[PDB]
From Swiss-Prot, chain A:
Protein name in UniProt: Nuclear pore complex protein Nup93
UniProt organism field: Xenopus laevis (African clawed frog)
Record-stated family: Belongs to the nucleoporin interacting component (NIC) family.
Gene symbol of the encoding locus: nup93
Purpose of the protein: Plays a role in the nuclear pore complex (NPC) assembly and/or maintenance.
Subcellular location per the Swiss-Prot or TrEMBL entry: Nucleus membrane; Nucleus, Nuclear pore complex
Length: 41, 36, 194, 46
């Protein structure tokens, strides 16, 4: 049933894409806050 | 609730539209709510 | 009266293209032009078949759907606006359908649209009927979600409901990620106590 | 349909989730023209 394989693949692809975008945003938040701490510091 | 719903649903010349609406207002659950 | 004949012949073309994509080199199925022709043709076929209002068309389009899904998954790198409008009308017809038979078709059309948006990052302005698109997505989400809610509540068919749920969730997530201003999202959430 | 209640048919097909573009056009247009009739400025107000 190549269909189910395809669909689960696309779904997990979306999930990984969102998790990665999330981690990237989180790291951006951390680093921006870090530069902010450095300036105010 | 079931009873008042049944009275609201009874095809009868005595239960006018107004009493139907009132019996409704006085009236596995989620599909029941969507149906209503 | 030619129904069973065309049905079997479609089963043949299906199995043929499947065994082809699994070993494209042996089939010499390297041609991305041919790959795209096949994908577009199977899509439009699923469309025209799913457009007829009045059971055969259902099963036929379902086979075509499984095919198109596996095919898009394998040929993604070879794989848009007109496709968007078409899948829009298709999901529209899938909505005007009785629910108990249109589930798999909705899931297929949804994954298709997801592939259509993931194929190229687009802003809401380039999405035709984006308002109507999100509207329908919201309607389907609301209905199916309330349904899954009642289904989980009566449990005081487990995985498929949650699958469709998470699916629509990520779908709307991406749709909102396309609308950074939320103004349309605002009108939506104002229309629906989601 | 028999009494040609355009607004009513619009509400009905809305409750039925049926989508027919030109039919909806006709429903709105029928509402407009029939109202413009039933008050034969007063027409546009109707």
């Amino acid at each position: 049933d190549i269909q189910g394989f395809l669909k689960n693949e696309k779904d997990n692809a979306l999930l990984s894409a969102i998790e990665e975008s999330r981690k990237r945003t989180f790291v951006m938040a951390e680093e921006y806050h870090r530069e902010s701490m450095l300036v105010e510091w | 609730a079931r009873v008042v719903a049944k009275l609201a649903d009874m095809h009868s010349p005595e239960i006018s539209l107004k009493q139907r609406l009132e019996y409704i207002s006085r009236a596995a659950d989620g599909e029941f709510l969507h149906e209503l | 009266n030619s129904l069973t004949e065309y049905q079997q012949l479609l089963s043949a073309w299906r199995m043929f293209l499947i065994v082809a994509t699994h070993n494209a080199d042996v089939m010499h199925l390297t041609n991305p032009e041919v790959r795209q022709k096949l994908f577009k043709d199977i899509l439009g076929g699923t469309q025209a078949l799913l457009v007829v209002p009045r059971v055969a068309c259902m099963h036929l389009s379902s086979m075509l759907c499984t095919v198109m899904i596996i095919l898009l998954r394998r040929w993604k790198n070879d794989l848009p606006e007109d496709i968007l409008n078409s899948l829009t009308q298709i999901l529209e017809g899938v909505l005007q359908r009785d629910q108990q038979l249109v589930e798999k078709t909705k899931a297929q059309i949804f994954s298709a649209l997801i592939s259509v948006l993931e194929m190229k990052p687009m802003k809401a302005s380039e999405i035709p009927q984006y308002s109507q698109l999100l509207l329908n997505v919201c309607e389907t989400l609301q209905e199916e979600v309330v349904s899954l809610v009642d289904h989980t509540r009566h449990e005081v068919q487990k995985d498929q409901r949650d699958g469709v749920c998470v699916l629509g969730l990520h779908l709307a997530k991406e749709l909102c990620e396309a609308d950074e201003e939320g103004d349309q999202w605002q009108q939506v959430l104002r229309k629906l106590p989601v | 349909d028999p009494f040609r209640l355009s607004e009513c048919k619009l509400a009905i097909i809305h409750c039925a989730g049926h989508s027919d573009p030109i039919l909806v056009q006709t429903l709105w247009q029928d509402i407009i023209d029939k109202e413009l009739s039933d008050s034969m400025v007063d027409r546009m107000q109707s």
